[PDB]
Amino acid sequence: MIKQAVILAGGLGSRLKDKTKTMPKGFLEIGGTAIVEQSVQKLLAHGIEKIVIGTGHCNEYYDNLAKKYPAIITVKNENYANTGSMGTLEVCASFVNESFLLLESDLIYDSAGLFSLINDERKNLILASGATKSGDEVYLEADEKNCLTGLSKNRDALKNIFGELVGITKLTKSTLDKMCAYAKIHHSDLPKMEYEHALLEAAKTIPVAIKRIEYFVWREIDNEDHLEMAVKNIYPHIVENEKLRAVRREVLLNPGPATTTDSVKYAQVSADICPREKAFGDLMQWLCDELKLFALASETNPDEYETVMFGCSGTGADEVMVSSCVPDTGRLLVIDNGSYGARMAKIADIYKIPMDIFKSSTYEPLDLQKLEAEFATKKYTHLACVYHETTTGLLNPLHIICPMAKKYGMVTIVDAVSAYCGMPMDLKSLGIDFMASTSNKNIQGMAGVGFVICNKAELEKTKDYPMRNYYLNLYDQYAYFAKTHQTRFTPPVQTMYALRQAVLETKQETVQKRYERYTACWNILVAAIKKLGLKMLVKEEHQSHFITAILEPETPKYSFEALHDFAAEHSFTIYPGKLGNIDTFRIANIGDIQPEEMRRFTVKLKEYMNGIGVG
Amino acid sequence: MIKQAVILAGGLGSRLKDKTKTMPKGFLEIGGTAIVEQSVQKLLAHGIEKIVIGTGHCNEYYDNLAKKYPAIITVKNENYANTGSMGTLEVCASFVNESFLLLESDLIYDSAGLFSLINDERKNLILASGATKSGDEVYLEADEKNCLTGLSKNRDALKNIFGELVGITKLTKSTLDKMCAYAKIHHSDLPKMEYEHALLEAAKTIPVAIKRIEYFVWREIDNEDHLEMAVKNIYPHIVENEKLRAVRREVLLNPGPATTTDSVKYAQVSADICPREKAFGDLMQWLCDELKLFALASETNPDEYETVMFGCSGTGADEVMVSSCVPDTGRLLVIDNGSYGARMAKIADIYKIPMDIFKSSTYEPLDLQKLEAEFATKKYTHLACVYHETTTGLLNPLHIICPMAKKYGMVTIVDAVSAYCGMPMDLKSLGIDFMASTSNKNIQGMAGVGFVICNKAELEKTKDYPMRNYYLNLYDQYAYFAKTHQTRFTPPVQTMYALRQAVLETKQETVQKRYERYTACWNILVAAIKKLGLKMLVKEEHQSHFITAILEPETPKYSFEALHDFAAEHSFTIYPGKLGNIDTFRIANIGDIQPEEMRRFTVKLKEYMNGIGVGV
Ligand SMILES: NCCP(=O)(O)OP(=O)(O)OC[C@H]1O[C@@H](n2ccc(N)nc2=O)[C@H](O)[C@@H]1O
Numbered sequence A: 001m002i003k004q005a006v007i008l009a010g011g012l013g014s015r016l017k018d019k020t021k022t023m024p025k026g027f028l029e030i031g032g033t034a035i036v037e038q039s040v041q042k043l044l045a046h047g048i049e050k051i052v053i054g055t056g057h058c059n060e061y062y063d064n065l066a067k068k069y070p071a072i073i074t075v076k077n078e079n080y081a082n083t084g085s086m087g088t089l090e091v092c093a094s095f096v097n098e099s100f101l102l103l104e105s106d107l108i109y110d111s112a113g114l115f116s117l118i119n120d121e122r123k124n125l126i127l128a129s130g131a132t133k134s135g136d137e138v139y140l141e142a143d144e145k146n147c148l149t150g151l152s153k154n155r156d157a158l159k160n161i162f163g164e165l166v167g168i169t170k171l172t173k174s175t176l177d178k179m180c181a182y183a184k185i186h187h188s189d190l191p192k193m194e195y196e197h198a199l200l201e202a203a204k205t206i207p208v209a210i211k212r213i214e215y216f217v218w219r220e221i222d223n224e225d226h227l228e229m230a231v232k233n234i235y236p237h238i239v240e241n242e243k244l245r246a247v248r249r250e251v252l253l254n255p256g257p258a259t260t261t262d263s264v265k266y267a268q269v270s271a272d273i274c275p276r277e278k279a280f281g282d283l284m285q286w287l288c289d290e291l292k293l294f295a296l297a298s299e300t301n302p303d304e305y306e307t308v309m310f311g312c313s314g315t316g317a318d319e320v321m322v323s324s325c326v327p328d329t330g331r332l333l334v335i336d337n338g339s340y341g342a343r344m345a346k347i348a349d350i351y352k353i354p355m356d357i358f359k360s361s362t363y364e365p366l367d368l369q370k371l372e373a374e375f376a377t378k379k380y381t382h383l384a385c386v387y388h389e390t391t392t393g394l395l396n397p398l399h400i401i402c403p404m405a406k407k408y409g410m411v412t413i414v415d416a417v418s419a420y421c422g423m424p425m426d427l428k429s430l431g432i433d434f435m436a437s438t439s440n441k442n443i444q445g446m447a448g449v450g451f452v453i454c455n456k457a458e459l460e461k462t463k464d465y466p467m468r469n470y471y472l473n474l475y476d477q478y479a480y481f482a483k484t485h486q487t488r489f490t491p492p493v494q495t496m497y498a499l500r501q502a503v504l505e506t507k508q509e510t511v512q513k514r515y516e517r518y519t520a521c522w523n524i525l526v527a528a529i530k531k532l533g534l535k536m537l538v539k540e541e542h543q544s545h546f547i548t549a550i551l552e553p554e555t556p557k558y559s560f561e562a563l564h565d566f567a568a569e570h571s572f573t574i575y576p577g578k579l580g581n582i583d584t585f586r587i588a589n590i591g592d593i594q595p596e597e598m599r600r601f602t603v604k605l606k607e608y609m610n611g612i613g614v615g
Numbered sequence B: 001m002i003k004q005a006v007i008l009a010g011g012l013g014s015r016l017k018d019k020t021k022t023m024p025k026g027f028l029e030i031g032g033t034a035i036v037e038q039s040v041q042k043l044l045a046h047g048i049e050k051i052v053i054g055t056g057h058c059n060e061y062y063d064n065l066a067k068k069y070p071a072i073i074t075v076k077n078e079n080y081a082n083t084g085s086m087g088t089l090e091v092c093a094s095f096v097n098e099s100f101l102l103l104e105s106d107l108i109y110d111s112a113g114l115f116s117l118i119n120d121e122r123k124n125l126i127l128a129s130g131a132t133k134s135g136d137e138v139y140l141e142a143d144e145k146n147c148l149t150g151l152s153k154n155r156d157a158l159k160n161i162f163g164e165l166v167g168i169t170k171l172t173k174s175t176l177d178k179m180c181a182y183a184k185i186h187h188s189d190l191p192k193m194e195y196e197h198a199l200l201e202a203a204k205t206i207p208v209a210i211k212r213i214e215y216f217v218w219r220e221i222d223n224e225d226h227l228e229m230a231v232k233n234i235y236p237h238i239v240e241n242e243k244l245r246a247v248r249r250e251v252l253l254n255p256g257p258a259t260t261t262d263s264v265k266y267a268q269v270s271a272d273i274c275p276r277e278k279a280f281g282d283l284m285q286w287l288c289d290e291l292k293l294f295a296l297a298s299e300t301n302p303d304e305y306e307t308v309m310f311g312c313s314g315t316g317a318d319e320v321m322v323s324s325c326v327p328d329t330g331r332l333l334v335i336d337n338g339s340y341g342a343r344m345a346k347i348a349d350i351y352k353i354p355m356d357i358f359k360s361s362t363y364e365p366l367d368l369q370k371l372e373a374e375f376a377t378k379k380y381t382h383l384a385c386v387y388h389e390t391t392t393g394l395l396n397p398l399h400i401i402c403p404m405a406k407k408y409g410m411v412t413i414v415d416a417v418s419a420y421c422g423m424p425m426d427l428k429s430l431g432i433d434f435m436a437s438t439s440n441k442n443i444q445g446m447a448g449v450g451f452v453i454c455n456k457a458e459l460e461k462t463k464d465y466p467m468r469n470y471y472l473n474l475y476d477q478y479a480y481f482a483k484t485h486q487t488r489f490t491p492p493v494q495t496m497y498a499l500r501q502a503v504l505e506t507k508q509e510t511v512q513k514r515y516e517r518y519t520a521c522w523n524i525l526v527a528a529i530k531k532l533g534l535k536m537l538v539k540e541e542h543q544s545h546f547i548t549a550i551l552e553p554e555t556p557k558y559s560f561e562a563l564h565d566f567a568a569e570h571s572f573t574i575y576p577g578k579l580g581n582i583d584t585f586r587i588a589n590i591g592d593i594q595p596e597e598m599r600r601f602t603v604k605l606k607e608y609m610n611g612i613g614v615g616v
C-alpha cells in the first residue's frame, strides 16, 4: 500500500494572471472547494497517511490548509522563483522515505486514478490519458514494454505518442534519489529543471512504465481555457464518476456498528496478503501504537502502555480482561449497573474467579460513599466496571471511581467499549490499568477487532498467572507478538485494513471534535425530545451524549415496531430499549452521523409522535 | 442488498437477420464470450443469487447456459412469437419474490450500473444515459422529481428528453404486480405489449425514478450497426472501466488467507446495517443453512445438522468445540500428529478437561490398529482430531477413524479448518458430530467468521454441560440465535457479507470442481518438485493436495529468506516450514489460484533452485 504522497505546489501560476497574483492556483475553487483540498481529501481517502506539500509562492495558503489536515507537512522551496518544479521536489525528498504518489497542484481528477496506480504491480508508474485537446499537453514516448523513453510538449520531438502525462505518478524512493542526484548535479546549468525532465533521465536506467487510461477524466488548470474545460465539462463528469462508487448511506441511530464513511468501507478492499508477512506485522504494530494514543493525554508517556488486538467482539475483549487479569489469589468486585456490568460478573462467575457484585440502578448514578466503603474493606484486589453503560446512556464517573480504586491499592479493569474515541480519555490520570474497546464503536471502523489497552507494568504483572482459556488470554497474545512480530492466529486481515483507515480518520477529526459532533447531535435530539413532551430515563447531567434512552409514550397507539418501520423508510435505524422492567426506546448518535442528519430524524420523529397524538 | 434479477430473453432478434436465425442475440460473442453470459457474470459478482431468464426463441441456448450457472432458472414463454417483452416478463413473475434487477438480454454495460442501482436508496429506478447516437433509442420524459412520465422511440412525442433507457431497471415486487395486472387487463387489445409500456403505466401511480448517468458506457445490440459500435468502441471502453476497479492480484501460496476473487473483496462494501435487524438475522440464518451443506452429501438430511457462527479465528472455533463439547463426566482422547492436534490438546489441558493424548508422527500416517486398541479400552467418551494437518499437508483418514470411534460409542470432534470446502465431505457417513472451519480457508472468503457444523442431536446433548467460558460457548451461541434470530454479540457484519459471496461462488464452482482445481495445481507443483530433485516430507498417497511440505536443500546457498523474497518480487507468497527438527518450506495452492499460475510459480522456483545449484 502507498502511505506517502508529495504535492508540488511552489509555482507562480503566472499564466492565470490576476487569479494567481495573490494565491497559488491549487486554491482555485470549483464546486465550492480549493482543487488542491479536494486532491488532499482523495489522497487521504485512499489511505495516504503523510502528504508532503512543497510550497513557495503564497505558501501561507498551504500552511493554513495544513491546519485543517494533520497529515500535511509543508516545506518551502525558498528559491521557488528561480527553480522549476524539480527544485521544489528536491526540498521535499528528505521527507519521503518509501514509495509514494507524486502529484501536480493544478489537477482535478477521478480518484480512480489513485486506486489504479496503487493497485498496479509495477513499482514506477506514470498515469497517462488519451487525447484531451486541452493545450499544453505533455506527450509521452514509450517502448514496447510501455516504459518511458521520451517526453515533450512538442509532439513532433517524439518518435511515438503513447499518451499524455496526467501529473499523478507512483515512484520508489530509489527513483526519487536518482532524480534528486541528477537535479543537484545540474543546479548551475539547468536551474529551472522540471520534474518531468529528471524523471525522463531517471527512466534511462530504472524502468518507468506508463499506464494509459484512454478515457481517464482529468484536467490541469494552467490558464483560463483549462478552467473553462474544468468548470463546464470535466468537474461535473468527475463528480458523476465518483458518485458511481457511492455506497447506500443508512443513518444508524444504534450504538455501533454505526454509519461509516465510504473510505472506511473501501479500505477493506486491498491486495490479498499473508498475515505473517513482515509488512502485515508492521501494520499490526502501527495499529497497536496508534490505538493507545486515543486513550492517553498528550503528556502521558505512550511507552507506559500497550495495545493487545484480538479477532473478537467487545464482549470478547471484556472477557479477555476478566479472564486474564485477576488471579485466584485475589478477589474481584464487579460494578453491575447495566447489561455490560452484569455481563462481566457472569463471565467472572463462569470462570470461578473470586468475586462480589456491587449492584446499582441502571439509570441513576452510583452511590460513591457505599462504593468507597466496599474498597475500604480491603477484600478486593481488582475492580471491573463500565465507563458508558450503553444499556441506558448512563455515564459512570470513572474519573472519580478508578483513581479512588487505585488509592485503595486495587487494579482497575474498565469496559470503555462505547466510550473510547467518543470522549477524551487519559488512562494515566483516570487511574485505569486495563481498558477494552472495539473497532466498530466510536472509532468508526468495521466490526471484528477487539483490543485491550494496558498499563504495561500491570500487564507484565500477569505474566505468571495460570491461563484460564487460550484464544482470549491477554498475556500470551501480547507476548507472542512482542517476540515474533506476528499475531498468534489468523487475524481479520481486511477488517484491520479498515481499522487503520478509521484510525487515520480519527486523527484527522481528533477525538475532541468527534466528541463535539456527537454532543451537537445529542443537543438536537434532547431539544426535540423536550418539545414533544417525551421523557428521558437518565438525567441529562448523567448521560454520555452517545445514546439516549427515551420512555415509550403511554398511549396504546405507540409501538416500537411502528416507529421503527417508519423511521427505516427514511433511512434511519432506531434501537429498542434494553430493560425488562421499564419500557424505553433508544436513539444513539455516533459513527459518521452529521448534525443535519439528526435534525432530519427529529422531524420524522415529530411526524410519527404527532400522528399518534403525542406532542 | 438486491438478491434477484430477471433477464427477458424470449425475442427473435429479427433485425440481426442470419445471425439470429438459429440463435438468441444474447449469445452474440464479444471478446470470446456471449454478451448475455457476460451479464450473468456481472450479476453474480454483485451478489445476485437467482437469475430468472425468460426464454422463447431458441430457448435451448439458455437452458445449456443454465447448466453452467446454477443460480439461473429458465422459464419459457411458449407464446413468444405472439407476445412482446412484457409477456415474457409475465411468465417470469411468479419466480420473483423480492426487489429485483430487470435486464434486457442484448446489453453490454459497465457493471458500475449494477452497483449504482443497488446502492441508490430509491426503490424503483431506471438506469438512463446521456445521448448515444446509436439508433433505436428509447427516450425518457421526466417530471421535476426525475420520475418517469412518458417514454417513446419518437423524440417529438415527449415533452422533454431526460435520458435514454439503458435496459437495466431496479423494481419492487409490488411494481411488478402492477405491471403484470395492467398487462393481463390488455391481453386482448395489446398482446405484444413491451415491458417499457407497462412500466410507464405503473409509473402513473407508483413513482419510478430515473438515474441518469450522463457518460454511462453501454450498448444494446439489435442490428449490425449496434454490433459495430459495441465491438469497435463500447466494449473496449467497458473493459477499461472495469479494470480500473481491479485489485492487485498477489498469488498466495500460503494456506489461508489466500488469493480471493475481487467480487469476494467488494462484497465487503455495503450499506451500514445494525446486526440485530431482521434482514441481518435472515442473512446469518442463510449462512448457517448454506455452510452446513458443503459438509453434507445431498442424500443426507440437512435438518439433522446445525451451524454455529462466531466472530473468531479457526483456533477460536477449535476452542469452541474443545471447551463446549466434553463435560467433566467424560474423558477426551486427543490425536496429536501435528501443530493443530497438539493445539487442541493444549486447549483441553488449560480448561482441565479429563483427557489423554494419542501421539503420532507429523508425517507418517497414523496406525489405525493402535488407535482402535485405544478406543476399545472404553475409557474415552470423546475424540478430538484434525482432518488436514496443514503443518505438513498430512491428511488423516477420517473416513475410517471417525466411524470407528462412533462404533466404540464416542462423540467425534473434528478440526476440518483446512479441509472443509476443499474436498467433498459428508458428516453423516464420516461419523463426525462436530466440525470446525472458518471463512478464510477453502471457502475463499475473508477472515473473521469461525464456525462449527453440528450433529443436531449431539449439539442438543451439550445443553446439560456447565459453561467453561462465555464468548466461545457453543450451546449458548446456538440457543440465543434460535430464540431471538439475533447473534449474542456484535458479529463482523461486513465479513459476513463477504462470506455470503464466497458461499455463492462455492455453490457456483462446486466443492467437487474446486477439489479438482486445487489438485490440478498440486499435480503441477509435484511434477516440478520431482524434476528438480526436491523431496517431499509426506508421501503423496497420504497428502491432502492442499499444501506441500518440501525438504529444504542442503546447500549453504539456500535460504528460505532468499527464495521467499525472490518469489515475492514475482507476486508469489510462499510459507515457511513449521517443524522443530526437520527443515522444510511449504507451498499451498488453495484460494482463487489457477493452474497456469502454479505453473508460473514452478518456472520461477526452477530459476531460483537452478541458480543455487539444485536441479542440474
Ligand atoms: N505537467 C506540467 C503542465 P504545467 O506546465 O502547466 O506545469 P505547472 O506550471 O502547472 O507546474 C507544475 C507543478 O509544479 C509546481 N511547481 C512549479 C514551479 C516550481 N518552482 N515549483 C513547483 O512546485 C507547480 O506549483 C505546479 O503544481
Ligand SMILES: NCCP(=O)(O)OP(=O)(O)OC[C@H]1O[C@@H](n2ccc(N)nc2=O)[C@H](O)[C@@H]1O
Binding pocket: B008, B009, B010, B011, B012, B054, B056, B080, B081, B083, B084, B085, B086, B087, B088, B089, B104, B105, B106, B136, B138, B165, B167, B196, B220, B221, B222
Ligand atoms: N429497450 C428495448 C428496445 P428494443 O427495440 O431493442 O427491444 P428488443 O427487441 O432488443 O427486446 C428487448 C428484450 O426483450 C426480449 N423479448 C422480446 C420479445 C419477446 N416476445 N420476449 C422477450 O423477452 C428480447 O429477447 C430482448 O432481450
Ligand SMILES: Cc1ncc(COP(=O)(O)O)c(C=O)c1O
Binding pocket: A255, A313, A314, A315, A316, A318, A340, A386, A388, A389, A390, A415, A416, A417, A418, A438, B489, B490, B491
Ligand atoms: C459498554 C459495552 N460493553 C460491551 C459491549 C459488547 O460489544 P460487542 O457487541 O462488540 O460484544 C457493548 C455493546 O454495545 C457495549 O456497549
Ligand SMILES: Cc1ncc(COP(=O)(O)O)c(C=O)c1O
Binding pocket: A489, A490, B255, B313, B314, B315, B316, B318, B340, B386, B388, B389, B390, B415, B416, B417, B418, B438
Ligand atoms: C488445521 C488447522 N487448524 C486450525 C488452524 C487455525 O486457524 P486460525 O489461524 O484461523 O486460528 C489452522 C490454520 O492454519 C489449520 O490449518
Ligand SMILES: [Mg+2]
Binding pocket: A136, A220, A222
Ligand atoms: Mg501544464
Ligand SMILES: [Mg+2]
Binding pocket: A104, A106, A220, A221, A222
Ligand atoms: Mg500545469
Ligand SMILES: [Mg+2]
Binding pocket: B136, B220, B222
Ligand atoms: Mg432496441
Ligand SMILES: [Mg+2]
Binding pocket: B104, B106, B220, B221, B222
Ligand atoms: Mg434491443
